[PDB]
Amino acid sequence: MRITLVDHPLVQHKLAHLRDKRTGPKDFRELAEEVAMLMAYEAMRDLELEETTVETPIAPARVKVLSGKKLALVAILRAGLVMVEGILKLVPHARVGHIGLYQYYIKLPPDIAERRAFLLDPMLATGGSASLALSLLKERGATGVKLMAILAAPEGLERIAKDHPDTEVVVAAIDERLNDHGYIVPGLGDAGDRIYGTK
Amino acid sequence: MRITLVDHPLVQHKLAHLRDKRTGPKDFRELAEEVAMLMAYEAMRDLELEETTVETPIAPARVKVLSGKKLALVAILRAGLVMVEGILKLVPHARVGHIGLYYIKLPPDIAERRAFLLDPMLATGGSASLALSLLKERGATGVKLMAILAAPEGLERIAKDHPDTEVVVAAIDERLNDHGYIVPGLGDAGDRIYGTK
Amino acid sequence: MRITLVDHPLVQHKLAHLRDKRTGPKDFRELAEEVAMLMAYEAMRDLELEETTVETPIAPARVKVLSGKKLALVAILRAGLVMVEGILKLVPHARVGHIGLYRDPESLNPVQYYIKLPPDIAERRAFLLDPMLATGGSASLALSLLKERGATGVKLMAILAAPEGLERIAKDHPDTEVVVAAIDERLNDHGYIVPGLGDAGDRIYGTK
Amino acid sequence: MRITLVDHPLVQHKLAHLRDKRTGPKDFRELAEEVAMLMAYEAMRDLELEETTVETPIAPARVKVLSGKKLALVAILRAGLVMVEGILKLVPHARVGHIGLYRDPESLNPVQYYIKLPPDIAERRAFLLDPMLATGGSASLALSLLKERGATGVKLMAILAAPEGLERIAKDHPDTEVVVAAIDERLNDHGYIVPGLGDAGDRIYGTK
C-alpha cells in the first residue's frame, strides 16, 4: 500500500495551527480547506491528459486537457465535507459523493467506474470508517481510489493496508497512536467539532 | 538563469481553457486565479520553517512553522491583480504591494520578506525588469517572478537585467508577434480577465 | 405562521438560471450559494445590536456590535450544505449544525441518519436551511429535532416552496418563520415541486 | 443629492470591527468584502428585469432575468479593489473597470495613473467603488472620467463618507447617487475621516 506524505512547508505550518488548541472554528475550517487544496496538488499529479487543438485570440495552439469524465470527490460525513469545499476551489467541475456511517447513507456520482476518485477522511484513526467506505466504493465499481487524510494513526494505516492493499493514502502527517478514547495522538482533537463549532 | 516550469496536469488543463478564445471573463478570471494558486505550490516549496511545540486538545505536539515576517505578493497592474487574489486563498496573511508602469506601494520591511512578483504575461520582460529594479532599490531580495506565459525574449531580458531572479512559469511560448503579443499566448490578459478591451 | 417572500431582482434572475435544466452542477451550486447569501440579508436584518466603543487609528468611536452568542446555521443534508456555504461568506463565525435526512421515494417521508448542533442552541439565533420545501415532511422533522433541543425563533430558509409544504409547517410548527424566494404551484405525483427545478441535491453535486 | 444609508445590523457590526484599530489586514480585507456585499444588495434593488421562460427538469416555467448588458463595477485603486471582489461574489459576470488614483499628501488632490473601463459603459448599470469618501476629490474626478465616456446613472459606493466629501460630489456631480455605510464627523488636518478607520488601502493590504 502506497503512503504518500505531503511535505510542503505551507502544509506543515497550517497543520501546526490546526493542532494548536487555541485555534477557533473559523480559522480551523479555513486552514483545513487550505490543507485539502494543497494536498490535492500532490494527489492529482497523475491526472491523465490528452492532446487537442485550441484557437487562441492570436493563433491556433496545441494543448492538453484532462481525459475522461470529471473526477469524483467522496466525503465521509461529517468532517470530510470541509475537504470537499477546499478542493472544489481547485477543481469546481468535480462531481461530489457523500458517505455517512451509522446502516449507512451513500450518494455517489453516476458511472464512478469511469472517474478518478478521491476519498476524503480528515482523521484516519482506527481506519474503520475509511475501510468500510472503500468497500462501498469498490462495490459500486470504483477503481484506483486515493484516500486523503490530514492526520493518520499507525493503527489506521495498518487497517487500510490490511483490507484494501491496492489503495494509496495521501496524508499530511502520521502521528504516534490512538489514545484511551480513540483519538489520534497528539492529533488535533475532534476534527468535526473544531470545524463547525459543535464542541 | 533560474527557471521553474510548473508541471501539473491541472495547470496544463486550465491553461488550455485560458488560451481558448471562447473562454469568457468569468471563467478566465477563475481559471487564472486557480493557475496562480497551483503555481504558488511550487514557488513556495522553499519557504523556511522553524521548530516549536504547541498544545493540542489531546497533548503536546512538536511542529514546524514558517519563520520570519509574512511573505509579500507584489502585483504588476493590471493583470497581476488576478494572481494576488488567487494566491491569497492559500496564504491570506500575505502582505500585498502594487506596481503600475509610476505608481508603487509595498509592505514595510520587504527586505525581510520572501517576495513574489506577479506578472501574468512575461512578454518583452520590460515591465517585470523595471519592477524588479524598484524592488531591489527598496531592499527586496531573492524575488521570484511568477508568470503564466513567458516568451524567450522576456526570459532573456530578465536573465540579462536580473540574473538573480528565479522565474516560475506555466509555459514558455514561441515568440512575440509584431505587436508585443505572446505567440500563441492567449491575447490580452487584462481585458480577458475583466471584460474590457 | 409567518412567511417572508424575498423580492430582489438578483434573486429572481438567479432563480431563473437555477430552474433552467441546462444549468450544470458547477453553476447551479454557485447560483444556489449566491441566492442563499441574498436571502440572508432579509433574514438577518433583525439581528440585535448593542452599543460599545473602539479606538480607531484616528480617534475613539461609539459603535454597535451584535449581542449574544454567535448565530447557528443548520443544514439539512445534502442540499442545505450549499446554503450554509454561501451564508458563511457573510457570517463566517456562525456555528454550523447538520441534520441528515433523505426523503423515502415511496412513502415520501423523511429518514433520519444524523444530527449535530452547536451547543447553547437556545441562546443563539437559529436558521434552518434546505432549498426545497415540498411536502414539508423533512423540514418539519428537522424543526422538531431543533425544538426538542431548546431552539426557538427558528427561521426556515428555502429557495422554493409548494403551498402544500408551507401548510405542513404551519400545521406542525406555527412558530417557525419561513423565508422563501418563490412559492410554486404544487407537487407532482412523485413529490416534486412544479415547476420547481428538479432534485436540488443531484443538481448541486452532480449525482443520480 | 440621493444618499442611501445602508441600515443593516451586519453592516453596523462589521463597520465597528473595521473601525477598531486592532483589526489586522486579513480580517479587515474580509470585513470590507462582506460590507461591500451587504451594500450591493440595496444598491442593486434597482436592477431592471425582463420576462421569459425556461424548461425545468419538471416543466416549463415563466421567470424573470436581468435585462440589457452586464453591469459594471469600477474600482478606484487601491482600496476599491476589495469592494469589487466582495461584490463579484454576488454578480460574477460583472465587467470590472479600474481607475488608478492616489492622493498627493500635500494638496490632497488626486493623481491619475490608470483607467480602463468595460466597452459601451453607456449601456450598463454602473457602480463606482471607493471605500472612503474623504474630500471627495478622487471620486469626483473618477465620476468625471466615467461621464465623458458615456456612463450615466452611476451610483458611488463608499463605506464611510465625510460631509465635505458628500458636498464635493453634490457640487461637482449632483445627479450622482451615493450609497454609504455611515456618515462621519469631519476630515482632520491630513484629510483623514474622523473618526473613520485610518488609511483603507494600507489596512487592507498591510502597507504604510
Side-chain angles (χ1 to χ4, degrees), chain A residues 155-187:
Chain A
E155 185 186 316
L157 292 169
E158 295 184 57
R159 176 51 175 288
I160 299 300
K162 179 183 177 184
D163 312 318
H164 297 290
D166 300 315
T167 291
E168 188 183 321
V169 177
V170 188
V171 64
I174 303 175
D175 283 44
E176 49 200 55
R177 60 187 174 70
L178 294 184
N179 77 323
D180 10 294
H181 273 180
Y183 276 130
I184 299 182
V185 188

PDB file of all heavy atoms in Angstrom, chain A residues 155-187:
ATOM      1  N   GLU A 155      -2.281   2.635  13.641  1.00  0.00           N
ATOM      2  CA  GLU A 155      -3.359   1.661  13.701  1.00  0.00           C
ATOM      3  C   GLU A 155      -4.294   1.767  12.494  1.00  0.00           C
ATOM      4  O   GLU A 155      -4.820   0.759  12.016  1.00  0.00           O
ATOM      5  CB  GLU A 155      -4.162   1.854  14.985  1.00  0.00           C
ATOM      6  CG  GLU A 155      -5.236   0.800  15.192  1.00  0.00           C
ATOM      7  CD  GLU A 155      -6.108   1.094  16.394  1.00  0.00           C
ATOM      8  OE1 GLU A 155      -5.551   1.464  17.451  1.00  0.00           O
ATOM      9  OE2 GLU A 155      -7.346   0.946  16.285  1.00  0.00           O
ATOM     10  N   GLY A 156      -4.491   2.988  12.000  1.00  0.00           N
ATOM     11  CA  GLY A 156      -5.374   3.197  10.865  1.00  0.00           C
ATOM     12  C   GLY A 156      -4.778   2.800   9.530  1.00  0.00           C
ATOM     13  O   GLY A 156      -5.428   2.141   8.714  1.00  0.00           O
ATOM     14  N   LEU A 157      -3.540   3.211   9.294  1.00  0.00           N
ATOM     15  CA  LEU A 157      -2.872   2.878   8.046  1.00  0.00           C
ATOM     16  C   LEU A 157      -2.789   1.361   7.916  1.00  0.00           C
ATOM     17  O   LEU A 157      -2.996   0.805   6.832  1.00  0.00           O
ATOM     18  CB  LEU A 157      -1.476   3.504   8.016  1.00  0.00           C
ATOM     19  CG  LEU A 157      -1.467   5.032   7.924  1.00  0.00           C
ATOM     20  CD1 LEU A 157      -0.065   5.570   8.166  1.00  0.00           C
ATOM     21  CD2 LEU A 157      -1.982   5.447   6.555  1.00  0.00           C
ATOM     22  N   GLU A 158      -2.500   0.694   9.028  1.00  0.00           N
ATOM     23  CA  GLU A 158      -2.408  -0.759   9.036  1.00  0.00           C
ATOM     24  C   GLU A 158      -3.750  -1.348   8.629  1.00  0.00           C
ATOM     25  O   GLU A 158      -3.817  -2.270   7.815  1.00  0.00           O
ATOM     26  CB  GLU A 158      -2.032  -1.264  10.429  1.00  0.00           C
ATOM     27  CG  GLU A 158      -0.650  -0.843  10.890  1.00  0.00           C
ATOM     28  CD  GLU A 158      -0.281  -1.441  12.233  1.00  0.00           C
ATOM     29  OE1 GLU A 158      -0.296  -2.686  12.351  1.00  0.00           O
ATOM     30  OE2 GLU A 158       0.025  -0.670  13.167  1.00  0.00           O
ATOM     31  N   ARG A 159      -4.819  -0.799   9.199  1.00  0.00           N
ATOM     32  CA  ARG A 159      -6.168  -1.266   8.910  1.00  0.00           C
ATOM     33  C   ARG A 159      -6.502  -1.170   7.425  1.00  0.00           C
ATOM     34  O   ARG A 159      -7.171  -2.044   6.880  1.00  0.00           O
ATOM     35  CB  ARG A 159      -7.183  -0.466   9.740  1.00  0.00           C
ATOM     36  CG  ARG A 159      -8.644  -0.784   9.455  1.00  0.00           C
ATOM     37  CD  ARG A 159      -8.919  -2.274   9.505  1.00  0.00           C
ATOM     38  NE  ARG A 159     -10.339  -2.568   9.351  1.00  0.00           N
ATOM     39  CZ  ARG A 159     -11.251  -2.328  10.286  1.00  0.00           C
ATOM     40  NH1 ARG A 159     -10.889  -1.793  11.446  1.00  0.00           N
ATOM     41  NH2 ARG A 159     -12.527  -2.617  10.060  1.00  0.00           N
ATOM     42  N   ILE A 160      -6.030  -0.117   6.767  1.00  0.00           N
ATOM     43  CA  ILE A 160      -6.304   0.057   5.348  1.00  0.00           C
ATOM     44  C   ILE A 160      -5.444  -0.876   4.507  1.00  0.00           C
ATOM     45  O   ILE A 160      -5.933  -1.497   3.564  1.00  0.00           O
ATOM     46  CB  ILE A 160      -6.058   1.518   4.900  1.00  0.00           C
ATOM     47  CG1 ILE A 160      -6.991   2.461   5.667  1.00  0.00           C
ATOM     48  CG2 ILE A 160      -6.284   1.656   3.394  1.00  0.00           C
ATOM     49  CD1 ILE A 160      -8.470   2.192   5.453  1.00  0.00           C
ATOM     50  N   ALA A 161      -4.164  -0.975   4.850  1.00  0.00           N
ATOM     51  CA  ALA A 161      -3.249  -1.842   4.114  1.00  0.00           C
ATOM     52  C   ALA A 161      -3.689  -3.293   4.233  1.00  0.00           C
ATOM     53  O   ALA A 161      -3.352  -4.123   3.393  1.00  0.00           O
ATOM     54  CB  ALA A 161      -1.835  -1.683   4.647  1.00  0.00           C
ATOM     55  N   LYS A 162      -4.455  -3.590   5.276  1.00  0.00           N
ATOM     56  CA  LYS A 162      -4.936  -4.944   5.511  1.00  0.00           C
ATOM     57  C   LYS A 162      -6.215  -5.287   4.754  1.00  0.00           C
ATOM     58  O   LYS A 162      -6.403  -6.432   4.353  1.00  0.00           O
ATOM     59  CB  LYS A 162      -5.160  -5.161   7.010  1.00  0.00           C
ATOM     60  CG  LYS A 162      -5.697  -6.536   7.379  1.00  0.00           C
ATOM     61  CD  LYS A 162      -5.954  -6.632   8.880  1.00  0.00           C
ATOM     62  CE  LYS A 162      -6.551  -7.978   9.266  1.00  0.00           C
ATOM     63  NZ  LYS A 162      -6.891  -8.034  10.718  1.00  0.00           N
ATOM     64  N   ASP A 163      -7.092  -4.309   4.550  1.00  0.00           N
ATOM     65  CA  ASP A 163      -8.349  -4.578   3.856  1.00  0.00           C
ATOM     66  C   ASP A 163      -8.410  -4.061   2.431  1.00  0.00           C
ATOM     67  O   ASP A 163      -9.221  -4.527   1.630  1.00  0.00           O
ATOM     68  CB  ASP A 163      -9.518  -3.997   4.643  1.00  0.00           C
ATOM     69  CG  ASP A 163      -9.462  -4.357   6.104  1.00  0.00           C
ATOM     70  OD1 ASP A 163      -9.150  -5.527   6.410  1.00  0.00           O
ATOM     71  OD2 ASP A 163      -9.737  -3.477   6.944  1.00  0.00           O
ATOM     72  N   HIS A 164      -7.559  -3.092   2.114  1.00  0.00           N
ATOM     73  CA  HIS A 164      -7.536  -2.516   0.775  1.00  0.00           C
ATOM     74  C   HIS A 164      -6.112  -2.161   0.367  1.00  0.00           C
ATOM     75  O   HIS A 164      -5.806  -1.010   0.054  1.00  0.00           O
ATOM     76  CB  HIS A 164      -8.436  -1.277   0.733  1.00  0.00           C
ATOM     77  CG  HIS A 164      -9.877  -1.577   1.007  1.00  0.00           C
ATOM     78  ND1 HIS A 164     -10.675  -2.267   0.119  1.00  0.00           N
ATOM     79  CD2 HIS A 164     -10.653  -1.318   2.086  1.00  0.00           C
ATOM     80  CE1 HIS A 164     -11.881  -2.421   0.640  1.00  0.00           C
ATOM     81  NE2 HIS A 164     -11.892  -1.856   1.833  1.00  0.00           N
ATOM     82  N   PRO A 165      -5.220  -3.162   0.359  1.00  0.00           N
ATOM     83  CA  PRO A 165      -3.806  -3.020  -0.001  1.00  0.00           C
ATOM     84  C   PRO A 165      -3.547  -2.224  -1.277  1.00  0.00           C
ATOM     85  O   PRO A 165      -2.558  -1.498  -1.368  1.00  0.00           O
ATOM     86  CB  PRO A 165      -3.343  -4.467  -0.119  1.00  0.00           C
ATOM     87  CG  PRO A 165      -4.167  -5.154   0.919  1.00  0.00           C
ATOM     88  CD  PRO A 165      -5.534  -4.568   0.674  1.00  0.00           C
ATOM     89  N   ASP A 166      -4.423  -2.362  -2.266  1.00  0.00           N
ATOM     90  CA  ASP A 166      -4.241  -1.639  -3.517  1.00  0.00           C
ATOM     91  C   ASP A 166      -4.886  -0.262  -3.468  1.00  0.00           C
ATOM     92  O   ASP A 166      -5.602   0.145  -4.387  1.00  0.00           O
ATOM     93  CB  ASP A 166      -4.802  -2.448  -4.685  1.00  0.00           C
ATOM     94  CG  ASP A 166      -4.118  -3.792  -4.838  1.00  0.00           C
ATOM     95  OD1 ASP A 166      -2.869  -3.836  -4.762  1.00  0.00           O
ATOM     96  OD2 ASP A 166      -4.826  -4.803  -5.041  1.00  0.00           O
ATOM     97  N   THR A 167      -4.621   0.446  -2.377  1.00  0.00           N
ATOM     98  CA  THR A 167      -5.149   1.785  -2.175  1.00  0.00           C
ATOM     99  C   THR A 167      -4.007   2.687  -1.747  1.00  0.00           C
ATOM    100  O   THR A 167      -3.174   2.298  -0.926  1.00  0.00           O
ATOM    101  CB  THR A 167      -6.230   1.807  -1.073  1.00  0.00           C
ATOM    102  OG1 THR A 167      -7.400   1.122  -1.535  1.00  0.00           O
ATOM    103  CG2 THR A 167      -6.597   3.236  -0.711  1.00  0.00           C
ATOM    104  N   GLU A 168      -3.961   3.885  -2.317  1.00  0.00           N
ATOM    105  CA  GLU A 168      -2.922   4.842  -1.964  1.00  0.00           C
ATOM    106  C   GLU A 168      -3.473   5.800  -0.917  1.00  0.00           C
ATOM    107  O   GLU A 168      -4.605   6.269  -1.030  1.00  0.00           O
ATOM    108  CB  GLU A 168      -2.486   5.639  -3.192  1.00  0.00           C
ATOM    109  CG  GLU A 168      -1.278   6.510  -2.938  1.00  0.00           C
ATOM    110  CD  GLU A 168      -0.909   7.354  -4.133  1.00  0.00           C
ATOM    111  OE1 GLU A 168      -0.996   6.847  -5.269  1.00  0.00           O
ATOM    112  OE2 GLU A 168      -0.518   8.522  -3.935  1.00  0.00           O
ATOM    113  N   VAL A 169      -2.676   6.085   0.107  1.00  0.00           N
ATOM    114  CA  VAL A 169      -3.094   7.003   1.152  1.00  0.00           C
ATOM    115  C   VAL A 169      -2.228   8.261   1.135  1.00  0.00           C
ATOM    116  O   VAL A 169      -1.001   8.188   1.231  1.00  0.00           O
ATOM    117  CB  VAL A 169      -3.001   6.346   2.540  1.00  0.00           C
ATOM    118  CG1 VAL A 169      -3.373   7.346   3.620  1.00  0.00           C
ATOM    119  CG2 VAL A 169      -3.924   5.146   2.601  1.00  0.00           C
ATOM    120  N   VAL A 170      -2.874   9.412   0.985  1.00  0.00           N
ATOM    121  CA  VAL A 170      -2.180  10.690   0.973  1.00  0.00           C
ATOM    122  C   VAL A 170      -2.472  11.315   2.329  1.00  0.00           C
ATOM    123  O   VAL A 170      -3.636  11.456   2.727  1.00  0.00           O
ATOM    124  CB  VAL A 170      -2.700  11.610  -0.143  1.00  0.00           C
ATOM    125  CG1 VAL A 170      -1.815  12.844  -0.251  1.00  0.00           C
ATOM    126  CG2 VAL A 170      -2.738  10.856  -1.463  1.00  0.00           C
ATOM    127  N   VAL A 171      -1.417  11.678   3.046  1.00  0.00           N
ATOM    128  CA  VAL A 171      -1.578  12.243   4.374  1.00  0.00           C
ATOM    129  C   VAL A 171      -0.621  13.402   4.611  1.00  0.00           C
ATOM    130  O   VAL A 171       0.450  13.472   4.004  1.00  0.00           O
ATOM    131  CB  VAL A 171      -1.334  11.147   5.447  1.00  0.00           C
ATOM    132  CG1 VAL A 171       0.113  10.675   5.378  1.00  0.00           C
ATOM    133  CG2 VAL A 171      -1.675  11.664   6.830  1.00  0.00           C
ATOM    134  N   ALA A 172      -1.018  14.324   5.481  1.00  0.00           N
ATOM    135  CA  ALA A 172      -0.164  15.457   5.802  1.00  0.00           C
ATOM    136  C   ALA A 172       0.835  15.009   6.871  1.00  0.00           C
ATOM    137  O   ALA A 172       1.988  15.442   6.881  1.00  0.00           O
ATOM    138  CB  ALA A 172      -0.997  16.623   6.314  1.00  0.00           C
ATOM    139  N   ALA A 173       0.393  14.126   7.760  1.00  0.00           N
ATOM    140  CA  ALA A 173       1.263  13.638   8.824  1.00  0.00           C
ATOM    141  C   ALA A 173       0.765  12.352   9.473  1.00  0.00           C
ATOM    142  O   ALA A 173      -0.435  12.057   9.474  1.00  0.00           O
ATOM    143  CB  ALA A 173       1.433  14.719   9.888  1.00  0.00           C
ATOM    144  N   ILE A 174       1.707  11.589  10.023  1.00  0.00           N
ATOM    145  CA  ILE A 174       1.398  10.338  10.704  1.00  0.00           C
ATOM    146  C   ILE A 174       1.787  10.513  12.164  1.00  0.00           C
ATOM    147  O   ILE A 174       2.953  10.747  12.476  1.00  0.00           O
ATOM    148  CB  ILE A 174       2.192   9.162  10.105  1.00  0.00           C
ATOM    149  CG1 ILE A 174       1.892   9.047   8.610  1.00  0.00           C
ATOM    150  CG2 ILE A 174       1.824   7.868  10.820  1.00  0.00           C
ATOM    151  CD1 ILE A 174       2.722   8.004   7.897  1.00  0.00           C
ATOM    152  N   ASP A 175       0.806  10.414  13.055  1.00  0.00           N
ATOM    153  CA  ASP A 175       1.051  10.581  14.482  1.00  0.00           C
ATOM    154  C   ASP A 175       1.483   9.280  15.158  1.00  0.00           C
ATOM    155  O   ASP A 175       1.693   8.264  14.495  1.00  0.00           O
ATOM    156  CB  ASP A 175      -0.196  11.174  15.159  1.00  0.00           C
ATOM    157  CG  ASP A 175      -0.342  12.676  14.912  1.00  0.00           C
ATOM    158  OD1 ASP A 175      -0.143  13.119  13.763  1.00  0.00           O
ATOM    159  OD2 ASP A 175      -0.659  13.419  15.865  1.00  0.00           O
ATOM    160  N   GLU A 176       1.602   9.309  16.481  1.00  0.00           N
ATOM    161  CA  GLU A 176       2.062   8.147  17.232  1.00  0.00           C
ATOM    162  C   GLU A 176       1.071   7.036  17.558  1.00  0.00           C
ATOM    163  O   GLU A 176       1.423   5.859  17.467  1.00  0.00           O
ATOM    164  CB  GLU A 176       2.744   8.618  18.517  1.00  0.00           C
ATOM    165  CG  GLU A 176       1.939   9.624  19.309  1.00  0.00           C
ATOM    166  CD  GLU A 176       2.794  10.428  20.273  1.00  0.00           C
ATOM    167  OE1 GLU A 176       3.780  11.050  19.814  1.00  0.00           O
ATOM    168  OE2 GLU A 176       2.479  10.443  21.484  1.00  0.00           O
ATOM    169  N   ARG A 177      -0.159   7.385  17.927  1.00  0.00           N
ATOM    170  CA  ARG A 177      -1.137   6.354  18.277  1.00  0.00           C
ATOM    171  C   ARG A 177      -2.533   6.901  18.555  1.00  0.00           C
ATOM    172  O   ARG A 177      -2.809   8.083  18.353  1.00  0.00           O
ATOM    173  CB  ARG A 177      -0.658   5.621  19.525  1.00  0.00           C
ATOM    174  CG  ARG A 177      -0.494   6.564  20.703  1.00  0.00           C
ATOM    175  CD  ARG A 177       0.150   5.906  21.906  1.00  0.00           C
ATOM    176  NE  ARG A 177       0.408   6.882  22.961  1.00  0.00           N
ATOM    177  CZ  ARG A 177      -0.539   7.474  23.682  1.00  0.00           C
ATOM    178  NH1 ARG A 177      -1.815   7.186  23.468  1.00  0.00           N
ATOM    179  NH2 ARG A 177      -0.210   8.363  24.610  1.00  0.00           N
ATOM    180  N   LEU A 178      -3.405   6.010  19.021  1.00  0.00           N
ATOM    181  CA  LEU A 178      -4.768   6.369  19.388  1.00  0.00           C
ATOM    182  C   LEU A 178      -4.804   6.318  20.907  1.00  0.00           C
ATOM    183  O   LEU A 178      -4.301   5.371  21.511  1.00  0.00           O
ATOM    184  CB  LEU A 178      -5.777   5.372  18.816  1.00  0.00           C
ATOM    185  CG  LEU A 178      -5.938   5.288  17.296  1.00  0.00           C
ATOM    186  CD1 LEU A 178      -7.063   4.319  16.972  1.00  0.00           C
ATOM    187  CD2 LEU A 178      -6.240   6.666  16.713  1.00  0.00           C
ATOM    188  N   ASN A 179      -5.385   7.338  21.528  1.00  0.00           N
ATOM    189  CA  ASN A 179      -5.454   7.388  22.981  1.00  0.00           C
ATOM    190  C   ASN A 179      -6.589   6.526  23.512  1.00  0.00           C
ATOM    191  O   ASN A 179      -7.350   5.931  22.749  1.00  0.00           O
ATOM    192  CB  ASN A 179      -5.629   8.835  23.457  1.00  0.00           C
ATOM    193  CG  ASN A 179      -7.049   9.344  23.279  1.00  0.00           C
ATOM    194  OD1 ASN A 179      -7.721   9.021  22.297  1.00  0.00           O
ATOM    195  ND2 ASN A 179      -7.507  10.156  24.224  1.00  0.00           N
ATOM    196  N   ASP A 180      -6.685   6.471  24.834  1.00  0.00           N
ATOM    197  CA  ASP A 180      -7.700   5.696  25.534  1.00  0.00           C
ATOM    198  C   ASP A 180      -9.131   5.885  25.012  1.00  0.00           C
ATOM    199  O   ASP A 180     -10.001   5.053  25.270  1.00  0.00           O
ATOM    200  CB  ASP A 180      -7.636   6.033  27.028  1.00  0.00           C
ATOM    201  CG  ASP A 180      -6.730   7.231  27.317  1.00  0.00           C
ATOM    202  OD1 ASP A 180      -5.498   7.125  27.110  1.00  0.00           O
ATOM    203  OD2 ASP A 180      -7.254   8.283  27.744  1.00  0.00           O
ATOM    204  N   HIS A 181      -9.373   6.969  24.276  1.00  0.00           N
ATOM    205  CA  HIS A 181     -10.708   7.241  23.741  1.00  0.00           C
ATOM    206  C   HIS A 181     -10.839   7.249  22.217  1.00  0.00           C
ATOM    207  O   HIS A 181     -11.800   7.799  21.678  1.00  0.00           O
ATOM    208  CB  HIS A 181     -11.238   8.564  24.297  1.00  0.00           C
ATOM    209  CG  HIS A 181     -11.955   8.425  25.605  1.00  0.00           C
ATOM    210  ND1 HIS A 181     -12.507   9.500  26.269  1.00  0.00           N
ATOM    211  CD2 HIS A 181     -12.233   7.334  26.358  1.00  0.00           C
ATOM    212  CE1 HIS A 181     -13.094   9.078  27.373  1.00  0.00           C
ATOM    213  NE2 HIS A 181     -12.944   7.768  27.451  1.00  0.00           N
ATOM    214  N   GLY A 182      -9.874   6.650  21.526  1.00  0.00           N
ATOM    215  CA  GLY A 182      -9.942   6.582  20.076  1.00  0.00           C
ATOM    216  C   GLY A 182      -9.474   7.796  19.295  1.00  0.00           C
ATOM    217  O   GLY A 182      -9.641   7.851  18.077  1.00  0.00           O
ATOM    218  N   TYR A 183      -8.893   8.774  19.976  1.00  0.00           N
ATOM    219  CA  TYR A 183      -8.410   9.964  19.293  1.00  0.00           C
ATOM    220  C   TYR A 183      -6.940   9.838  18.931  1.00  0.00           C
ATOM    221  O   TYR A 183      -6.155   9.247  19.670  1.00  0.00           O
ATOM    222  CB  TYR A 183      -8.614  11.204  20.162  1.00  0.00           C
ATOM    223  CG  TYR A 183      -9.997  11.802  20.053  1.00  0.00           C
ATOM    224  CD1 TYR A 183     -10.741  12.110  21.194  1.00  0.00           C
ATOM    225  CD2 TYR A 183     -10.558  12.078  18.802  1.00  0.00           C
ATOM    226  CE1 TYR A 183     -12.013  12.682  21.090  1.00  0.00           C
ATOM    227  CE2 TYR A 183     -11.825  12.646  18.687  1.00  0.00           C
ATOM    228  CZ  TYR A 183     -12.547  12.945  19.833  1.00  0.00           C
ATOM    229  OH  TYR A 183     -13.802  13.499  19.718  1.00  0.00           O
ATOM    230  N   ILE A 184      -6.578  10.392  17.780  1.00  0.00           N
ATOM    231  CA  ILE A 184      -5.197  10.359  17.320  1.00  0.00           C
ATOM    232  C   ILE A 184      -4.344  11.200  18.270  1.00  0.00           C
ATOM    233  O   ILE A 184      -4.773  12.260  18.719  1.00  0.00           O
ATOM    234  CB  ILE A 184      -5.090  10.910  15.880  1.00  0.00           C
ATOM    235  CG1 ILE A 184      -5.923  10.037  14.937  1.00  0.00           C
ATOM    236  CG2 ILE A 184      -3.637  10.952  15.437  1.00  0.00           C
ATOM    237  CD1 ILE A 184      -5.854  10.444  13.472  1.00  0.00           C
ATOM    238  N   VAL A 185      -3.145  10.709  18.580  1.00  0.00           N
ATOM    239  CA  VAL A 185      -2.223  11.392  19.491  1.00  0.00           C
ATOM    240  C   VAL A 185      -0.907  11.746  18.799  1.00  0.00           C
ATOM    241  O   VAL A 185      -0.301  10.904  18.136  1.00  0.00           O
ATOM    242  CB  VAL A 185      -1.875  10.498  20.704  1.00  0.00           C
ATOM    243  CG1 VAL A 185      -1.077  11.298  21.729  1.00  0.00           C
ATOM    244  CG2 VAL A 185      -3.141   9.927  21.314  1.00  0.00           C
ATOM    245  N   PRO A 186      -0.455  13.003  18.933  1.00  0.00           N
ATOM    246  CA  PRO A 186      -1.117  14.081  19.672  1.00  0.00           C
ATOM    247  C   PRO A 186      -2.320  14.644  18.912  1.00  0.00           C
ATOM    248  O   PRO A 186      -3.128  15.375  19.478  1.00  0.00           O
ATOM    249  CB  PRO A 186      -0.004  15.106  19.847  1.00  0.00           C
ATOM    250  CG  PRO A 186       0.790  14.936  18.596  1.00  0.00           C
ATOM    251  CD  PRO A 186       0.875  13.432  18.468  1.00  0.00           C
ATOM    252  N   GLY A 187      -2.417  14.304  17.628  1.00  0.00           N
ATOM    253  CA  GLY A 187      -3.519  14.761  16.794  1.00  0.00           C
ATOM    254  C   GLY A 187      -3.932  16.224  16.909  1.00  0.00           C
ATOM    255  O   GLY A 187      -3.089  17.121  17.002  1.00  0.00           O
TER     256      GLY A 187
END
